[PDB]
Write a protein that binds this ligand. Sequence first.
Ligand SMILES: [Ca+2]
Ligand SMILES: [Ca+2]
Ligand SMILES: [Ca+2]
Ligand SMILES: [Ca+2]
Length: 148
Amino acid sequence: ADQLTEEQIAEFKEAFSLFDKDGDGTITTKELGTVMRSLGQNPTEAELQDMIIEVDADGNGTIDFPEFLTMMARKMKDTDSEEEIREAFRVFDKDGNGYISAAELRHVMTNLGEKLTDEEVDEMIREADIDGDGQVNYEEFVQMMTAK
Ligand SMILES: [Ca+2]
Ligand SMILES: [Ca+2]
Ligand SMILES: [Ca+2]
Ligand SMILES: [Ca+2]
């Protein structure tokens, strides 16, 4: 993989402020726990502390913006649940070129009996189409699946 685009760095910077409620430039275990309980997750205080220590090798007690980039780097590692995502992607990506085009999604939708216009499909794709190419990239498909 190459280095992150200036655009990705900007995306992760806004995602950093989404995690950092103070805007002070740091994420603490309290803020980790704030996001966790907003997701309905109830781990122990010790688990939340170790989740900080996993990246806070420097020992200053917080996850700063470069460490947030490291926190994302440890999610760019293959995981078990990714197999289902890869299968679902290949159900829509019928020619296997690494992109789901609106036409390919429409093929599945037409077979389901959905009676949308191309413009209605376009609106659906727009929520995932970050780069504006009219298709869903693999990274964008993760974003598409993280929403509803
Ligand atoms: Ca903070
Ligand atoms: Ca640190
Ligand atoms: Ca395709
Ligand atoms: Ca796209």
